[PDB]
């Protein structure tokens, strides 16, 4: 280690001491602080323009359910059904009649589509379409029954009248019926153009009223769906982008700064890998076998690859965010996960700046020496944790509601060891103290042996390992 | 210990070192890993075929309550009652009339039983049957009252009409009335034969509408019950078991592998007990009294007896699971507990493989040296815990709802020390700050002295014992 | 300490070694174990006979509210009111009319009182009585208003008809009205005489329908109350006490055993105080000042005074429990607290028997050396805890519901540091983000600075003191 | 340090030893104990007079909603809306008609205002006023739309009749409509003058029924507001202040004692700063550089500046509390925060008296040596905590309700790591397992990685730092 002392210790420096190392004037770190401001402001003024459009989306549907569903009070979304045969007729007819009488009874001023799509013939806007099997004769007590999947879409066409038909003539064939759907579309004008100060968006909803009968169980649920397909509406007017282009040319700063930091930080990655070739031979091997691909690991800094990671996502995110002016994408999920996961991972990079101080390094490196020991034991618990998830899903599965699928059992058990919704699950078992009294006595032994296992002997390790690691770092 | 060194140290080995011990090629452990795949897949494809039949069971009843109970909205299962005398007449008659008019008003296409059982004469399908005392004259203010239990079942017979009677003529004798029941049966065809791709099941429900009056309290609850008695329905058709026997001959692999592992693991149990006779005398006793029936305990390995235990349950479980093709059992509880408790106890056997590594052994043996000290102290707490359960059941028993039986008090207190449903129980006491103000002041002193006892001086031991044991294992 | 070695070490012995001390055959401890069986069985068969009578009490009232209150659905107990002036007339008249027509419309077979009490003239059973001021002329915009408390009870008398009056002629004088009450009584026969196998109880309810108007706020609540005054009903019949006196002469065993143990244990108290006079002078004082009234404290054993305490309560409790055959007391609170607090304090005496073993003594004496240090710090927290209770009661008092009285704030805060009903109280503040936006910003700073104080710096002491005490006891 | 030994050690004394220092008779500390009684009694008898007026305020509104809102049942405050066009007409007309018929149908005896304010012409009491745009022609499918904010207030005037008009003639112009408001006022007399024993307050409510349509979404919410403007009512009567001035001249004791303590405690502040000039030079500097502005910090006692702080707030608070007799302020927030924050901060001053004992000093100074290390690490967590708040607000923002604004996300996450409302947020995500199945899989990974981070590796530090600090203070 004679002549490589100066260059291999420059790589192990800190910008508190780089200032007095060779006089570097470290703006190569200060640009990373600009991301903390610019990406978050890119994020916050993306969220507020998106939130205000969601409340317009999720409140016209609440308007539509009080106009298109017969007897719908509030709250009962998923428990709204039709049980008789004439409850199903009055539900269908009331949904059509309000559509034919929309500008007289409803406020809000919608207007019809006069569409040209696939489940509509030309002129037609509303179409109620049955679905039933091709040929099928099911009959209990004479069990000569034929089932062949071949569904026929019998649509009934109706267009809205222009100025102030035979759909009432309708049979349904219930013993073969699959589902009855209703399709229509409605344009409108958003009228929140005042706090935007300029020309607003212009919507087109797409309603699907669904009379679904899959289970053939004598109970038909009733649903409603919308998709706000947004595009701009026709105008020859001007003066809109006096301030609007001051948002349209802000993401170009995000395009600049994250890319210019993607250039800068990777050059250090280019520097660190380049300086590996010299330490390998290094005296025409003297020690030789001491380099072992884990002593190679402390060359590439883990903070930089995290800063490279966000900048891949961030400039991929904001280039997708450009698709709000004229691009026909409604991909409000892919553009949203990329921006949030960047900001979730940009802000954790601040902890690096806290480790430059001699006090805060103790608490963070306490996590670093203990993150192995927790992640070892977290595998020891997850094996037992998957044991109770498969056992509780079969025994307590048929009789209850919370324990029906694995994605609920892994939630109803995991929310239970922290101490939440515990008495409610004990109270739901005691509708079975008469009905099948073995399953009750298993459920008392299942639940008590689980909640008194993870708090009293598993949670205590996670307190003991960190205490056991905090003694090592300071002595 | 001269000549027994090699054989008594082979028994204390590990399959990480058995490979270099004598060249054994340890497939005698790899067969145990096959259970992890086969039993779980035996479990998961048992659950999904069982779940889909439960949702058909628990949704035809929800259909039946909206057809057979007068004025039943959703949610109010247990608080649905009839209070006047004419609420009870209109509830009975509406339950019969919908039965006589089922194919005209209900969708789902049920059909009648035309039964031959015990609470039905021949031809009859529906039977409403009173229950009242033989002779009894209760009268307040003239208390010459006779009570002798001798109940008479007065049934009224009615059969459904074939093509498009005197039950309206009915008296009830309320001062002697016990309960009025209604029995009928309905066959149907499940029509979820598409994702099964073959001939579906064919059900027969059994409805019991119960007008129960036990307490004679001027309030009659109303109930409904079903039991889906399933059997196959008549067909001369074929092509069903092109893929269905590929489930019917999968459990035979579970029959093979768990049994072949029941043969293998017990041979080591046969080996361990056989090698006990030599260590007893062992030098025509030299030490003699040192063997003390607890130094005998570390011979039989505790992991093997757990692997024997599941294989008893597993091949007993899956042989009961064969009763789904043609066996008339509906025993969906006994066959379910055995399979789940096996899988709960098969998956914990994976922890043995984690103890072969030098890191994971530390965390597990920390539990093993601390499982005595916790189970000592768990007896010290349960004595005090049963103290508050008997004290709170008498004082707070009459005035409240959660504290009515011991099986609720042992739930309402145990869910309370973890911190769940705590404010709701404090809020329920304050309907008694005027009504009997001593019981209120006891309830503030009962609850505060209990929740501030188990968190602050009992939960702290369970954190202290594990920390106190983690120092011993690593130093 | 020459000649007092043998007698002063006999007093420091254990019954594990008293057997080999002088051959005592320790039945003077085994009688204390008899209490564990006898008092608990005295308790459990007191609770089950009491529980079954409460469900008859609290279900006839639920019957009465569905017969006597106009438009009462379930659940809405405390939010049932009458707002107009004709809602109050229809509520009163419907309550009288159902009383006049009770045997025709209600099941359950009640019967009238034909009473002779104070708010009833002779023959009369029902009495609706106004309450209003003597003389008062309140008038806004002409504020010459007189208020003098002198209330007049104007009752209207009505008796039930015998075989198949002017109360409809009624004015109420609302501007002076205080409350309108309705009183009647109803006898009945309990008919759960079958599982008792003998002659049942015979009740007399006392209904009070209350139209309370205290606040004069334009909103009158409506209430209902009962008191089941129980006594036996008339009979010349016999054969009741073939098994019933086998309960009536079981408490005499509780009278025996607790008293015979009250005699035995106090003789040791008589022995311990008697042996104090000798240690005082003890060598015509040698050390003298070393006895300091805290070294006197370890003479009288703390376990015995607890066993004396329960036996005072237990034989006082069960002698009050004798008042269920013929004594006219309804004191079901005083007799219940004494029995439960005994059993709560009898069962903690079992821990003494656990301290005879060398293992369990460590965990219990860990509590004993740490019970000072916790109770010191519990005073340090309660000072700060009363600080937030007075601060939160004034600021957040007017705007919310949970924070209205101190008895709720001491519950809503104490249930909050354990982690229960936390988000619901944060959600209730955000109806004030527009209404008085200073109180909102205080409420975010009030709640966050409190819940993040007691979990993160106060709960951690209670874990640290016990860990800090567990190291002292074992080293 | 020769001659300044006596004076610089008098400043480091305790009143347990000041009694034997120079014979001081320490009433200069006992006056501070008088505040504990006087301020709290000033607080409690302020709260009870304020609480009783709030329940009169918040129960006349509950009366008003059952009289002025068409079809308002209880509970549904924020979900009460009008969806058709004729639901809006029947809601307006029913609100006017009940106002015109108030003394005939309502109890409580209100009376009209006959007002003279700004949204009322002379004589008029009720005024329903539209709001709509000046000129605007919005039309979908012909998008020549004009929007200019210029709102016109078209009021309709109506006065109540004196002894036993054209507002029914009304159009609304819905396509331009903004909001319809209704204003009126009602005086009354509180009649809770009995427990006050003297002349009560005399109120004037101000009702605002709001038909708000901002979003133009086809859904109009309906609201109600009151402001109880209180002043005294006209009387020539006397005898009121026989006991009432015994409250009016109690706050003057609070004016005395807190001010006389503000004089006393600040003289010690005047003493401590005065004695700093001597320690600076102190030997014409010998050490010189050892004084470093943090060794200056232990001169001014931190307990006194807290006692100065409350006395600033307390005498500012109670001088604002004088504004309840005749001052027209309704500022019941500013006068309330000052009194509560004083009492919150007066009561923490009691801990100083606990530190005079040798036992309680250990627990408090354990907090003092650990309050740095917690507040260091609390910055390390809040950086990561703001990361998840920005990430969860965009991804889970559109699809759910709890995650809509940052002020809820900082509550829904912070209430979640303590273990409250955890399963309810997992259950709300599973309405999206079909709808946009990427956002579901992110939500399982978002929530699990957060709740299993702060309990298992962040909560454990807060237990480890206090344990790590409790070892330092006692060894
Ligand atoms: C000049 C010829 C003789 C050299 C003899 C002395 C060698 C000595 O002067 O050092 C090498 C020097 C420093 O530049 P390096 O990048 O090689 O080394 C580190 C830098 O201090 C920072 O990077 P930079 O500011 O350059 O972007 C950064 O703080 C670190 O990484 P990090 O903290 O993780 O970000 C490292 O990367 O390189 C060249 O001579 C630069 C030449 C000047 C720039 C020319 C163009 C304007
Ligand atoms: C006999 C004359 C010479 C005495 C010389 C030896 C003295 C030595 O033999 O000891 C004193 C002896 C023991 O009786 P004591 O009661 O004085 O001393 C303890 C007893 O062992 C237990 O009480 P006991 O069984 O009596 O109810 C009890 O275990 C302890 O208290 P505790 O564990 O807290 O419950 C102590 O109280 O007293 C008398 O001589 C008893 C005489 C025999 C009974 C006569 C009537 C049947
Ligand atoms: C007298 C001339 C020769 C002096 C030589 C001895 C000097 C020695 O006697 O000491 C100085 C003495 C004590 O008074 P000081 O205030 O200077 O010093 C402390 C006092 O013991 C308390 O304050 P006090 O009771 O006065 O309000 C208080 O306990 C402390 O502060 P704290 O505990 O934080 O509250 C300190 O402030 O001052 C003057 O001589 C007082 C003169 C008598 C009062 C005259 C008017 C009635």
Q: Where are the domains of chain A?
A: 5-50+249-354, 69-225, 361-474
At what resolution in Å was this solved? Answer: 3.5
State whether residue C126 is helix, strand or coil: strand
Residue D131 CB neighbours (<10 A):
17
Query: Is C360:B376 a contact under the CB 8 Å cutoff?
Result: yes
User: Ramachandran region of residue D303, left (φ > 0), alpha (ψ -120 to 50) or beta?
Assistant: alpha
Please give, one letter per residue, the 3-state secondary structure of B287-329.
CCCCCCCCCCCCCCCHHHHHHHHHHHHHHHHHHHHCCCCCCCC
Query: Is A63:D218 a contact under the CB 8 Å cutoff?
Result: yes
For C423, which of D341, D415, D471 is closest by C-beta distance?
D415
What chain D residue is nearest to A50 in terms of C-alpha separation? D398
Largest CA distance in chain B: 99
Between chains, do C192 and B174 touch, taking CB under 8 Å as contact?
Answer: no
Residues 6+ apart with CB under 8 A from A112: A102, A125, A160, A184, A185, A186
Between chains, do B108 and A377 touch, taking CB under 8 Å as contact?
Answer: no
Q: How open is the CA angle B97-B102-B105, to the nearest 5 degrees?
A: 100
Query: Is B435:B443 a contact under the CB 8 Å cutoff?
Result: no
Query: Measured between CB atoms, does D419 come within 8 Å of chain B?
Result: yes
Tokens of C45: 């068969």
State whether residue A84 is helix, strand or coil: strand
Q: Which helix (H) or strand (E) holds A32?
A: helix A27-68
- Mutation to probe ligand 3, out of D17, D28, D31 (largest number of atoms < 8 A from CB): D28
Cα distance between residue B77 and residue B221, in whole Å = 10
Sign of the dihedral defined by the CA atoms of residues D330, D333, D334, D336, in that order: positive
Cα distance between residue A190 and residue A54, in whole Å = 12
Give the closest-approach CA distance of B472 to chain D in angstroms.
18
Between chains, do B411 and A390 touch, taking CB under 8 Å as contact?
Answer: no
Residues 6+ apart with CB under 8 A from D110: C140, C218, D102, D103, D186, D187, D188
φ and ψ at D179, to 5 degrees?
-160, 150
What chain D residue is nearest to C384 in terms of C-alpha separation? D348
For C419, which of D364, D418, D471 is closest by C-beta distance?
D418
DSSP bridge pairs for C126: C158
- Mutation to probe ligand 2, out of C15, C265, C268 (largest number of atoms < 8 A from CB): C268
State whether residue A158 is helix, strand or coil: strand
Q: Which ligand is nearest to the CA of A22?
A: 1
Q: Is A268 in the pocket of ligand 1 (CB under 6 A)?
A: yes
Chains with 3+ CB–CB pairs under 8 A to C are: B, D
Give C265 Cα–ligand 2 centroid separation in angstroms: 13
Cα distance between residue A314 and residue A320, in whole Å = 10
Cα distance between residue D84 and residue D91, in whole Å = 11
Give the closest-approach CA distance of C303 to chain D in angstroms.
28
Q: Is A321 in the pocket of ligand 1 (CB under 6 A)?
A: no
Closest to D43 measured CA to CA, from D304, D227, D313: D313
Cα distance between residue B3 and residue B349, in whole Å = 34
DSSP bridge pairs for B368: none
> Per-residue DSSP letters for D341-354?
HHHHHHGGGGHHHH
Of all protein residues, the one whose alpha carbon is nearest to atom 28 of ligand 2 is C28
Largest CA distance in chain C: 99
- If you count residue pairs, one on B and one on D, with CB atoms under 8 Å apart, how many are there? 4
Closest to D50 measured CA to CA, from D342, D311, D321: D321
Tokens of D345: 């901060």
Query: Alpha helix (H) ranges present in D275-301?
Result: 277-281
Cα distance between residue B11 and residue B21, in whole Å = 11
Cα distance between residue B372 and residue B376, in whole Å = 6
φ and ψ at B263, to 5 degrees?
-75, -40
What chain C residue is nearest to B437 in terms of C-alpha separation? C333
φ and ψ at D450, to 5 degrees?
-100, -50
Between chains, do D456 and A470 touch, taking CB under 8 Å as contact?
Answer: no
- Chain B CB contacts of A457 under 8 Å are 367, 370-371, 374, 462, 466
CB within 8 Å of chain C, chain D residues 115-174: none
Give D338 Cα–ligand 2 centroid separation in angstroms: 69
Query: Is D66:C83 a contact under the CB 8 Å cutoff?
Result: yes
Query: Alpha helix (H) ranges present in B12-160?
Result: 15-18, 27-68, 86-100, 102-105
Please give, one letter per residue, the 3-state secondary structure of A207-230.
EEEEEECCCCCCCEEEEEECCCCC
Residues 6+ apart with CB under 8 A from A145: A136, A137, A138, A139, B189, B235
Q: Is A352 in the pocket of ligand 1 (CB under 6 A)?
A: no
Tokens of B10: 């082979």
Query: Measured between CB atoms, does A384 come within 8 Å of chain B?
Result: yes
Query: Measured between CB atoms, does C473 come within 8 Å of chain B?
Result: no
Closest to B219 measured CA to CA, from C65, C226, C201, C229: C65
Q: Which helix (H) or strand (E) holds B211?
A: strand B204-212
Query: Is B279:B215 a contact under the CB 8 Å cutoff?
Result: no
Cα distance between residue C253 and residue C246, in whole Å = 11
CB within 8 Å of chain A, chain B residues 185-214: 187-194, 202
Residues 6+ apart with CB under 8 A from B452: none
Between chains, do C422 and D415 touch, taking CB under 8 Å as contact?
Answer: yes
Query: Alpha helix (H) ranges present in D212-359?
Result: 245-248, 251-274, 277-281, 302-321, 334-346, 351-354
Closest to D88 measured CA to CA, from D128, D115, D140, D56: D128
Query: Is D382:D410 a contact under the CB 8 Å cutoff?
Result: no
What chain D residue is nearest to C419 in terms of C-alpha separation? D418
Q: How open is the CA angle B149-B152-B154, to the nearest 5 degrees?
A: 155
Give CB contacts under 8 A, 24+ apart, made by B34-39: B34/B257, B35/B257, B35/B258, B35/B261, B35/B346, B36/B346, B36/B347, B36/B350, B38/B253, B38/B254, B38/B257, B39/B254, B39/B258, B39/B314, B39/B342, B39/B343, B39/B346
User: Ramachandran region of residue B61, left (φ > 0), alpha (ψ -120 to 50) or beta?
Assistant: alpha
DSSP bridge pairs for A82: A220
Atom of ligand 1 at shortest distance to CA of A11? Answer: 36
Q: Which helix (H) or strand (E) holds B223?
A: strand B220-225
Strand A126-129 vs strand A155-158: parallel, antiparallel, or unpaired?
antiparallel
Write down the experimental method used for this entry: cryo-EM
Between chains, do A219 and B63 touch, taking CB under 8 Å as contact?
Answer: yes
Of all protein residues, the one whose alpha carbon is nearest to atom 17 of ligand 1 is A271
Query: Is B261:B35 a contact under the CB 8 Å cutoff?
Result: yes
Query: Is D72:D221 a contact under the CB 8 Å cutoff?
Result: no
What chain B residue is nearest to C353 in terms of C-alpha separation? B380
State whether residue B106 is helix, strand or coil: strand
Tokens of D463: 């237990």
- Chain B CB contacts of A391 under 8 Å are 340-341, 343-344
Residue with tokens 């074929």: B238
Which regions of C119-203 does DSSP assign to beta strands (E)?
Answer: 126-129, 155-158, 179-187
Largest CA distance in chain A: 99
Cα distance between residue D234 and residue D306, in whole Å = 46
Give D126 Cα–ligand 3 centroid separation in angstroms: 70
């Amino acid at each position: 280690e004679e002549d490589l002392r100066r260059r291999l210790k420059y790589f192990f420096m800190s910008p508190c001491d780089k200032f007095r190392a060779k006089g570097r004037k470290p703006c190569k770190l200060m640009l990373q602080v600009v991301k903390i401001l610019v990406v978050t402001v890119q994020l916050i003024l993306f969220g507020l323009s998106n939130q205000l459009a969601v409340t317009f989306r999720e409140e016209n549907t609440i308007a539509f359910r009080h106009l298109f569903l017969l007897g719908y009070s509030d709250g009962a979304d998923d428990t709204f059904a039709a049980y008789t045969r004439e409850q199903l007729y009055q539900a269908i007819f009331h949904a059509v009649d309000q559509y034919l009488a929309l500008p007289d009874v409803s406020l809000g001023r919608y207007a019809y589509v006069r569409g040209g799509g696939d489940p509509w013939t030309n002129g037609s806007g509303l179409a109620l379409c049955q679905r039933y099997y091709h040929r099928g004769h099911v009959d209990p007590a004479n069990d000569t029954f034929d089932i062949d999947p071949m569904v026929v879409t019998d649509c009934i066409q109706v267009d809205p009248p222009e100025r102030p038909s035979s759909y009432k003539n309708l049979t349904l064939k219930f013993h073969k019926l699959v589902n009855v759907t209703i399709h229509f579309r409605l344009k409108t004008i958003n009228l929140q153009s005042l706090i935007n100060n300029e020309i607003p968006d212009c919507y087109t909803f797409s309603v699907l009223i669904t009379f679904d009968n899959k289970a053939h169980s004598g109970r038909i649920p009733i649903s409603l769906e919308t998709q706000a397909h947004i595009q701009e509406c026709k105008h020859p007017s001007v003066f809109q982008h006096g301030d609007n282009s001051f948002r349209l040319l802000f993401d170009v700063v995000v395009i600049l700064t994250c890319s210019l930091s993607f250039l800068l930080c990777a050059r250090s990655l280019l520097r660190g890998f380049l300086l590996q070739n010299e330490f390998v031979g290094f005296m025409w091997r003297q020690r030789g076998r001491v380099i072992s691909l884990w002593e190679r690991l402390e060359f590439v800094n883990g903070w930089y690859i995290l800063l490279v990671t966000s900048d891949v996502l961030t400039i991929s995110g904001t280039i997708m965010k450009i698709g709000i002016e004229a691009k026909n994408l409604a991909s409000y999920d892919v553009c949203s996960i990329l921006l949030g996961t960047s900001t979730l991972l940009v802000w954790v990079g601040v902890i690096r700046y806290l480790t430059f101080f001699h006090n805060y390094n103790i608490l963070i490196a306490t996590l670093r020496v203990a993150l192995p020991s927790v992640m070892r034991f977290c595998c020891c618990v997850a094996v037992i944790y998957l044991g109770y998830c498969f056992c509780g899903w079969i025994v307590l599965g048929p009789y209850h509601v919370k324990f029906r699928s694995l994605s609920m059992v892994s939630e109803c058990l995991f929310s239970l060891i922290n101490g939440d919704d515990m008495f409610v699950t004990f109270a739901a078992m005691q509708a079975q103290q008469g009905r099948s009294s073995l399953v009750w006595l298993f459920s008392q032994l299942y639940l008590y042996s689980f909640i008194s296992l993870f708090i009293y002997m598993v949670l205590s390790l996670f307190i003991a390992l960190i205490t056991g690691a905090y003694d090592t770092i300071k002595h």
